[PDB]
Amino acid sequence: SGFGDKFKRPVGSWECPVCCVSNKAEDSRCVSCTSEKP
Amino acid sequence: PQVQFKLVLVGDGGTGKTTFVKRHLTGESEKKYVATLGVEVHPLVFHTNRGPIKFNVWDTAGQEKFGGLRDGYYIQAQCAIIMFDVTSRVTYKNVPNWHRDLVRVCENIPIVLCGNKVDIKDRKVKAKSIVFHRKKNLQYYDISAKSNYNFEKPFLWLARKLIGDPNLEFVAMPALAPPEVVMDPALAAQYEHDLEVAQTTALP
Numbered sequence A: 001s002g003f004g005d006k007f008k009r010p011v012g013s014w015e016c017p018v019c020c021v022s023n024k025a026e027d028s029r030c031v032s033c034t035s036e037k038p
Numbered sequence B: 001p002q003v004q005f006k007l008v009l010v011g012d013g014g015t016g017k018t019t020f021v022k023r024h025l026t027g028e029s030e031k032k033y034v035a036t037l038g039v040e041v042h043p044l045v046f047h048t049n050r051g052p053i054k055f056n057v058w059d060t061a062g063q064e065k066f067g068g069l070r071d072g073y074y075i076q077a078q079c080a081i082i083m084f085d086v087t088s089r090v091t092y093k094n095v096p097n098w099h100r101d102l103v104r105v106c107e108n109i110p111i112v113l114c115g116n117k118v119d120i121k122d123r124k125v126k127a128k129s130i131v132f133h134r135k136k137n138l139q140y141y142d143i144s145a146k147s148n149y150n151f152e153k154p155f156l157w158l159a160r161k162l163i164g165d166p167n168l169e170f171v172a173m174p175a176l177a178p179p180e181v182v183m184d185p186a187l188a189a190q191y192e193h194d195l196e197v198a199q200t201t202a203l204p
């Protein structure tokens, strides 16, 4: 069974467009590179 | 959404981190520059019997030559490779420092220890001396970035740990830059043999 089929992103999570880190909904900037939520 | 993991690639300057990550051609052509941290994030896709897995590999711009790396570099890393150079003993002596710096921010994420440049005749750090991984119960591999030797092994181990599937396989190798040096096959057999023998021994 493919792990890509069952994979779901956390509710409210956003991928940082600059560095690809997964961030939380209540975080206005990326916890890693400080880039701003798109 | 894609299955992807932040992989930090750390180790002393000159150990071959940039060369190694650059072997993966699409990761190099599609790398993303992070200006705030001076980082290049290489998206390395590998194709497993259960679908694709992308390691976003974070490569420095040389800052490790002047001091430790800033918190943001390690933040939210899900796995790591610690690299040293088997022709430079002090790069192996600094491995505990990199491990400590890494776990201080990321705690117990899966980590692979790699000894690079095994294509070079005059190898200084032989298998018998490589013991740090056994003290921290980590996986170790000899690699040669310039010859692609064992390039996929750390990533396969990490994928197996992260997914929780010990039977995971890469159904095909990624497109890699052609080898710039040849890795003598018999030399590779000899080094792997020395590694397993060293595993037989116990650590004083």
Ligand SMILES: Nc1nc2c(ncn2[C@@H]2O[C@H](COP(=O)(O)OP(=O)(O)O)[C@@H](O)[C@H]2O)c(=O)[nH]1
Pocket (backbone or CB within 6 Å): B011, B012, B013, B014, B015, B016, B017, B018, B019, B020, B062, B116, B117, B118, B119, B120, B143, B144, B145, B146, B147, B181
């Ligand atoms: N013979 C050999 N030379 C290597 C290898 N990897 C790197 N080198 C060289 O080591 C020097 C530093 O490499 P680099 O990728 O910049 O290391 P970094 O500072 O850790 O990012 C360079 O001259 C590389 O060409 C290898 O696997 N075999």
Ligand SMILES: [Mg+2]
Pocket (backbone or CB within 6 Å): B017, B018, B019, B060, B061, B062
């Ligand atoms: Mg570099």
Ligand SMILES: [Zn+2]
Pocket (backbone or CB within 6 Å): A016, A017, A018, A019, A020, A021, A030, A031, A032, A033, A034, A035
């Ligand atoms: Zn970011």
